[PDB]
Write a protein that binds this DNA or RNA. Structure first.
Lengths: 453, 315, 296, 513
RNA sequence: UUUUUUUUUUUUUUUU
RNA sequence: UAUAUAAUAGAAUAAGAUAAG
């Protein structure tokens, strides 16, 4: 299909929308990738809108910073800085979020300065899009965030935002770790002033964001709990697990809401997937509520479906089961045998959590232990002293005694010896570690350990 | 599975090996399982390869635009002021010391580049490679690219491919060379012995000592030093032949054929791609991984996994 | 057509009005919210721009900065508003950000002793009317005559001087135009005097005149674009019936707290017309007007 | 051709030392004669491009480099000329920064940092400019869409100072370039227009075109200059080009020229030679004639006949204006309308959200479009495009699809969800959605609740007839919220304070509830 | 529902 | 008696969960 570059960017944006919020059809992604592979804007002149759309659609579909189209778009964004108005700013920022080159950093910083300068002349759409775009880049421009929060408060004092805008705003301001109680109070007031215009689908994400941001005020949680209790009947498994997680994050011991939520969850036990079960178990671990019938139902369902268990799901499930105490025999075997197959997907801390959960329950399988131990050499660099201690104790309980695996863990322990030997807890854990490995395996850590510091 | 954020639902995995098949880039897509019959090589080509140990395919395997795309990707791989993303995904690169040199070589590129990933699954070369290995399964082992300097590109001395592939048990391999540029005796065309693939009943000549501080003459003349008298008698009748390749021309090479590459004395860089295909029932020799940061095999375990994907399966 | 309003600073709202009448801050912000909603719902303003709060109560009077005469955005002199220079620059920044004019015409800032006040300028069919009085001396009138008065055929743009007493509000408060040839005034001495003067100045044109309750602030978006809505204060219901009988659409608006603070509905908004700068002899897209396919 | 083959081979292998001028000569002979298979051979062109990329392009003009790049792009090789750096301290001359700007403009690769750098090295040496150099740099800065107005104002003042040393073309180009600059002052514009009208008796048609473009850009604040040029050009009206007559029409529409005596003369002169207009000029003439209220019985027929020969291959952005002109005018345009609908059916794939919405809106009340096959295709395309529609384009598309009788509850439900995501601000942005839903007459109760919660605040600014329509829509949809009907009855009470049976049944029913 | 905003800041004593 | 010139523009449009200090 031969088309102009603008006529290609339009269909590219449409394809991105259809693949994003209308089911992830692989054929659409493949067609878009093939179309964008041969697309170039070297000669033709385009608006900033078309170039921004092309860059965003290319970056969304997996194109890294080494491609020709991405390089041309970034060059255009670097040269013609004054043509990237507020309308086409969030698109460029969102596109550059994933890219971590030098040009991407420069473009992001320039757009941040532009947004912080013009933060008082925007509208609801522009402010919402700008804050949502700057949420994804991980930038830490606190002055810009303060300016945008002030503009949000002034613009919402006159009832401008609505349900979708409030959800996006809360998610963006919670992901950036901006604990402004006044801003979230204004967002909550605008939500409650939207009577019956905040549906369940627009109510659950708001509660999740308000839980994640970590607000000190406990009076706000009560209204969310009551409104959720009113809306329980109209929910699938996704939102049930979502509010389990959210009200675990709040940390307030509610009774009627938890009972009705458990009733609805056991009602929909035939629709739960691996991620929902893991989220529910993790939420119950965080809140401390012990519900053994629900745990039995979730364990049975997790036994029913095991292929869907991702590394995060496996880690959360085993950690919750080990902490609670309840544990199955064949479910653990299936989970360990599956994690052996996908041991190359565990993260820096998920691997430690899974290994320590399996070690703490006295469940040792050779295949899983070998896979996790061999994998525990590309992740020792990204480990805190507590996580390193947990992984070392798991290895000691696993009886690995392999220098190629042990020496990076001991290098990490030595490089973090102060936070390793001064942990308020874990003294008995380190004692057992050193009892297993003996004094001659690693001299310097022994010398430090017989000095208590 | 887990939950993927909305703006990350189209991203490709960090390791491109995680993609089960081939992306839609370059050629459209792999044909149906019963539509692979139009890429069969002629029996005369098979006989010529079995007699000489090498053969060039009758037609170029890539259209010109695909060649420009591949050349651009090779150029971006050798970037120095801004290092390529997914650089740590390669088995080895010439920029590990961040300095570089006249010759740029990159191995394991198919895990860190579009297009290059699709080049592995090309039916035109995979079907021919399968036909070479007695019409059997083919598994990609690894690929590399060479890019020579503008005017001081060095010449690779005489070499046998299997001299380094000692971990694979049987002699079941094939090499496909794709010329992204136009090559010549003064620009980097490959010069190889017309019959060295059947010397010593399949044995390997000892490694050749070369001085990297002199001209091409001694580099190309070490062949006499490394051979014996009888091999000299065979060589005298049929001298080594330099094959000139145009854009998209593919050259099938036996793993035991002695070949070298002339240096670059043109006015710009020259790029070439090597892809090494095994066959089925190819086994390991020793414990441990064959390539850096790969799956660890047993003593005589058959070679398989995600690092060595199956690219063509008859029947 | 873009309307610019400024959000009221909650903390610095005065406890009592200029005369001594007490006001409610919460009721004030509620009425401002309702005013913003009913200004958005006007169905004629393309976009309503909200300005950030300023630590002053008189900064709510955003209409004391500019007068739109013909196709020129004339700037009022800085004579008694020396504390509102930065406010005016910020408002001009807001106007620039919305695609409006880069700057204003300084035809009045350079004329000596030219003391003029907005609101005294009221639009009318092919002309304006200015109010001679305490806040607008004769030098402003003669400068306006020089700049805008045209007495040619098929190009006449005539400006009228309407003398008013020394205890009258700005002419735009109690005198205005609306709809297709509709006039609105208060039923007091000022309204009758202004109506009679304009009748003398334009005798051969017959006009519909509507009388309203004194002290009833109204707002009609009169201009080239035909409109029917007329914002009117909620408290008075006789004026609503009078406006409805004339064939216009009245919209009640709660405006008690501003009345206690002395700010009118006319002085709280700054209507402006922005036309796209066509390049290369092209014409932009207008708005859908009229009924399509009258004869099918 | 052994020698030719050897030359081609040596060029392919990159063994020939090529200069930029030699590559330019080869490109010229390949693009002009092409007796040999130069352009058809890919390898030779790739080698030539490799030689050109590594060459030194400072020894060629920007036009030559642009021609080389165009020749390379004509065959498939993505080529782009090198960017020239800012001259060093010794080479800072008025004739070199202008060269930098000219190359930046010609090669179509503009860097704003370079523009700022060459605008800060021009101010100290601005006293060394020739009178023509100022008129050149003004147009070069205008064509780069620079936002620096102070520099252009200083340049314009200097150009005014050297008035007697400049030709008519330079003055006209300076005037139009000044008019294109957004932030320039108005006193300078008035002085420039006075200068133009003083030296206005020497104008060629190109200068007329430039002056008309400047006036159209400036707007109705400069009526006197347009009146002067209209009075002067009345002698040349019969012997005049068509494009400048179209520009006269556009300026007449823009300025709202009340002197309707010369408008008839110019319009008749335009309609006499309207046969020699392209797509854009004909469309602009149509719009200008409609906005001046000039479409008569006969000239509309001639202009429509002229459009017929162009309607087959019209751009997607030139279909809605002609449809609007046909809709407003009461004359006969069935054949042109059918051709335009066929072209829109052809172009439905590439139509954007706004153009599709406008096309649907114009054909909302058109009787022949009811049975035309565009309804289903446009409905499906609008459902696909619903993610990209704006607050107003969505309303236009929904209104057009509801008026055409297109029935698909899924599309209207998705439009309702999209509108709830956007939010509503006018009754005209919410009514099409309501009638679209009422076409099927079914929606989930949550949709009804949200629609009523949107409607209720808006009921205080609706006329009685619009209240009747809203009540009809709400009764059809099946709402039961009491506050909505309370607000509607409260608004109705003001217009009709009497509960007498005089008002129709629906009104009594509404006030009862 | 009433808490807050508008500088050219340049003065940290290590041998890393 | 010389090997060579290259400039016309149009579009207003909002998706939404990272095991934190």
């Amino acid at each position: 299909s031969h088309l102009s570059a603008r006529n290609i960017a339009t269909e590219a944006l449409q394809m991105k929308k259809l693949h994003q919020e209308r089911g992830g059809n692989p054929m659409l992604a493949q067609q878009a990738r093939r179309v964008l592979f041969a697309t170039s804007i070297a000669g033709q002149n385009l608006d900033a809108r078309s170039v921004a759309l092309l860059l965003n659609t290319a970056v969304y579909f997996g194109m890294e910073s080494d491609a020709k189209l991405v390089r041309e778009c970034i060059d255009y964004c670097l040269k013609n800085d004054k043509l990237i108005t507020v309308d086409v700013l969030p698109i460029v920022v969102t596109a550059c979020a994933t890219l971590k080159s030098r040009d991407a950093r420069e473009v992001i910083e320039m757009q941040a300065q532009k947004a912080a300068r013009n933060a008082k002349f925007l509208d609801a759409k522009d402010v919402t899009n700008i804050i949502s775009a700057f949420s994804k880049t991980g930038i830490n421009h606190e002055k810009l965030f303060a300016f945008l929060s002030r503009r949000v408060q002034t613009l919402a004092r006159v009832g401008e935002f609505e349900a979708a805008h409030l959800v996006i705003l809360a998610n963006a301001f919670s992901r950036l770790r901006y604990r402004d109680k006044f801003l979230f109070g204004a967002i909550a007031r605008r939500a409650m002033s939207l009577r019956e215009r905040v549906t369940v689908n627009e109510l659950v994400p708001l509660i999740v964001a308000f839980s994640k941001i970590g607000l000190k005020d406990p009076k706000l949680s009560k209204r969310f709990a009551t409104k959720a209790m009113e809306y329980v009947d109209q929910m699938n498994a996704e939102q049930v697990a979502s509010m389990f997680m959210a009200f675990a994050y709040f940390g307030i011991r509610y009774d009627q809401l938890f009972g009705v939520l458990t009733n609805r969850a056991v009602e929909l036990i035939d629709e739960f997937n691996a991620q929902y079960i893991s989220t529910t178990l993790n939420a119950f671990q965080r809140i401390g509520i012990n519900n053994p019938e629900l745990f039995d139902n979730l364990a049975e369902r997790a036994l029913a479906v095991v292929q869907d268990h991702d590394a995060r799901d496996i880690s959360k499930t085993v950690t919750a089961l080990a902490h609670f105490g309840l544990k199955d025999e064949e479910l653990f075997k299936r989970l360990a045998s599956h994690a052996a197959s996908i041991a190359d997907q565990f993260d820096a801390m998920g691997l430690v959590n899974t290994a320590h959960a399996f070690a703490r329950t006295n469940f040792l399988q050779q295949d899983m232990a070998v896979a996790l131990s061999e994998r525990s050499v590309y992740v020792c660099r990204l480990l805190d002293a507590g996580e390193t201690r947990r992984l070392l104790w798991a290895l000691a309980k696993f009886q690995v005694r392999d220098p190629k695996i042990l020496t990076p863990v001991f290098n990490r322990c030595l490089a973090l010896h102060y936070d390793f030997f001064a942990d308020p807890t874990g003294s008995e854990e380190i004692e057992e570690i050193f009892d297993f490995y003996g004094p001659n395996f690693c001299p310097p850590l022994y010398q430090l350990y017989i000095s208590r510091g | 599975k887990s939950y993927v954020l909305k703006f990350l639902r189209g991203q490709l995995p960090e390791d491109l090996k995680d993609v089960n098949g081939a992306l839609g880039c370059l050629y459209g897509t792999l044909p149906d399982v019963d539509e692979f019959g139009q890429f069969v090589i002629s029996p005369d080509v098979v006989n010529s390869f079995h007699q000489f140990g090498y053969v060039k395919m009758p037609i170029p395997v890539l259209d010109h635009q695909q060649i420009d795309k591949l050349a651009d990707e090779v150029n971006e791989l050798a970037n120095n002021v801004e290092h390529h993303p997914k650089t740590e995904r390669l088995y080895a690169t010439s920029l590990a010391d961040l300095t570089g040199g006249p010759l740029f070589f990159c191995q394991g590129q198919w895990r860190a580049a579009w297009g290059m990933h699709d080049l592995i699954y090309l039916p035109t070369i995979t079907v021919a490679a399968s036909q070479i290995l007695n019409n059997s399964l083919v598994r990609l082992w690894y690929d590399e690219v060479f890019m020579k300097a503008a005017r001081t590109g060095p010449c690779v001395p005489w070499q046998q491919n299997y001299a380094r592939w000692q971990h694979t048990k049987p002699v079941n391999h094939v090499t496909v060379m794709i010329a992204l540029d136009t090559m010549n005796k003064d620009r980097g065309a490959p010069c190889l012995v017309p019959g060295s693939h059947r010397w010593r009943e399949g044995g390997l000549l000892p490694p050749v000592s070369y001085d990297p501080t002199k001209d091409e003459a001694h580099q190309l003349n070490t062949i006499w030093e490394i051979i014996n008298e009888e091999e000299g008698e065979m060589l005298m009748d049929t001298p080594p032949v330099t094959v000139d390749l145009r854009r998209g021309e593919a050259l099938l090479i036996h793993p035991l054929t002695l070949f070298a590459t002339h240096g670059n004395r043109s006015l710009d860089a020259v790029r070439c791609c090597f892809i090494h295909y095994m066959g089925e029932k190819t086994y390991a020799v020793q414990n441990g991984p064959l390539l850096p940061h790969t799956t660890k095999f047993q003593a005589d375990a058959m070679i398989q996994g995600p690092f060595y994907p199956v690219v063509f399966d008859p029947a | 057509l873009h309307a610019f309003v400024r959000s009221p600073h909650y903390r610095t709202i005065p406890s009592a009005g200029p005369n001594g009448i007490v006001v409610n801050r919460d009721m004030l912000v509620h009425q401002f919210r309702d005013f913003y909603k009913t200004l958005q719902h006007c169905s004629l303003v393309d976009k309503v721009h909200l300005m950030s709060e300023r630590p002053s109560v008189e900064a709510l009077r955003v209409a004391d900065q500019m007068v739109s005469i013909g196709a020129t955005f004339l700037e009022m002199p800085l004579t008694g508003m020396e504390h509102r220079a930065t406010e005016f620059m910020e408002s001009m920044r807001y106007v620039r950000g919305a695609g409006g004019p880069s700057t204003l015409a300084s035809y009045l800032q350079d004329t000596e002793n030219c003391r003029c006040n907005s609101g005294d300028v009221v639009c009318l069919p092919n002309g304006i009317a200015v109010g001679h009085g305490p806040r607008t001396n004769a030098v402003a009138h003669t400068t306006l005559k020089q700049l805008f008065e045209v007495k040619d055929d098929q190009f006449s743009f005539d400006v009228f001087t309407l003398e008013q007493e020394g205890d009258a509000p700005p002419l735009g408060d109690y005198f205005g135009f609306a709809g297709s040839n509709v006039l609105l005034t208060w039923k007091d001495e000022h309204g009758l005097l202004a109506v009679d003067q304009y009748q003398q100045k334009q005798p051969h044109t017959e006009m519909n005149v509507v009388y309203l309750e004194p002290g009833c602030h109204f707002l009609s978006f009169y201009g080239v674009d035909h409109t029917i809505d007329v914002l009117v204060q909620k408290g008075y219901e006789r004026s609503m019936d009078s406006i409805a009988a004339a064939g216009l659409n009245p919209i009640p608006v709660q405006w008690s707290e501003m009345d206690k603070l002395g700010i009118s509905m006319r002085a709280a908004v700054l209507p402006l017309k922005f036309f796209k700068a066509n390049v290369g002899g092209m014409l932009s897209r207008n708005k859908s007007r009229g009924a399509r396919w009258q004869t099918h | 051709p052994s020698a030719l083959h050897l030359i081609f081979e040596r060029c392919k292998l990159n063994l020939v030392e090529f200069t930029a001028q030699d590559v330019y000569q080869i490109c010229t002979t390949a693009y002009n004669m092409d007796t040999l298979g130069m352009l058809q051979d890919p390898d030779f062109m790739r080698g030539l491009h490799d030689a050109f990329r590594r060459s030194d392009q400072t020894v060629i003009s920007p036009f030559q480099a642009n021609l080389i790049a165009d020749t390379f792009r004509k065959v498939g090789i993505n080529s782009m000329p090198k960017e020239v750096s800012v001259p060093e301290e010794d080479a800072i001359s008025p004739e070199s920064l202008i060269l930098v700007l000219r190359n930046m403009n010609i090669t179509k690769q503009r860097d704003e940092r370079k523009i700022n750098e060459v605008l800060k090295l021009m101010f100290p040496i601005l006293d060394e400019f020739s009178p023509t150099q100022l008129s050149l740099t003004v147009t070069e800065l205008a064509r780069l869409k620079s936002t620096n107005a102070d520099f252009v104002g200083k340049l314009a003042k200097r150009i005014m100072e050297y008035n007697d040393d400049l030709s008519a073309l330079d003055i006209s180009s300076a005037a139009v370039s000044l008019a294109y600059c957004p932030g320039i002052s108005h006193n300078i514009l008035y002085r420039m227009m006075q200068i133009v009208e003083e030296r206005m008796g020497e104008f060629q048609p190109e200068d007329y075109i430039n002056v008309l473009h400047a006036l159209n850009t400036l707007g109705p604040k400069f009526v006197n200059t347009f009146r002067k040029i209209v009075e002067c050009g009345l002698q040349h009206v019969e012997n005049m080009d068509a494009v400048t007559l179209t520009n006269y029409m556009v300026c007449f529409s823009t300025m709202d020229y009340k002197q309707r005596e010369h408008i008839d003369i110019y319009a008749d002169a335009l309609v006499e030679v309207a046969t020699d207009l392209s797509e854009k000029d004909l469309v602009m003439a149509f719009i200008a004639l409609q906005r001046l209220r000039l479409l008569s019985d006969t000239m509309f027929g001639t202009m429509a006949s002229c459009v017929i020969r162009y309607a087959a291959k019209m751009d997607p952005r030139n279909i809605a204006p002609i449809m609007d002109i046909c809709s407003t005018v009461p004359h006969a345009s069935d054949h042109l309308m059918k051709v335009l609908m066929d072209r829109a059916v052809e172009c439905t794939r590439i139509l954007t959200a706004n153009q599709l919405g406008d096309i649907l809106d114009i054909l909302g009340l058109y009787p022949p479009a009811r049975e035309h096959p565009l309804v289903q295709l446009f409905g499906k395309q609008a459902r696909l495009r619903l993610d990209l529609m704006g607050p107003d384009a969505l309303a236009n598309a929904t209104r057009g699809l509801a008026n055409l009788g297109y029935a698909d509850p899924e599309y209207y439900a998705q439009a309702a969800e999209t509108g709830f995501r956007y939010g509503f601000k006018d009754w005209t942005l919410l009514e099409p959605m309501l009638m679209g839903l009422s076409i099927t007459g079914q929606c989930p109760p949550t949709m009804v609740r949200v629609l009523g919660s949107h409607i209720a605040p808006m009921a205080r600014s609706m006329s009685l007839m619009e209240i009747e329509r809203a009540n009809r829509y709400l009764r059809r949809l099946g709402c039961e919220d009491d506050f909505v009907y309370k607000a509607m009855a409260s608004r109705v009470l003001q217009f009709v304070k009497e509960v007498t049976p005089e008002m129709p049944e629906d009104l009594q029913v509404l006030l009862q509830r």
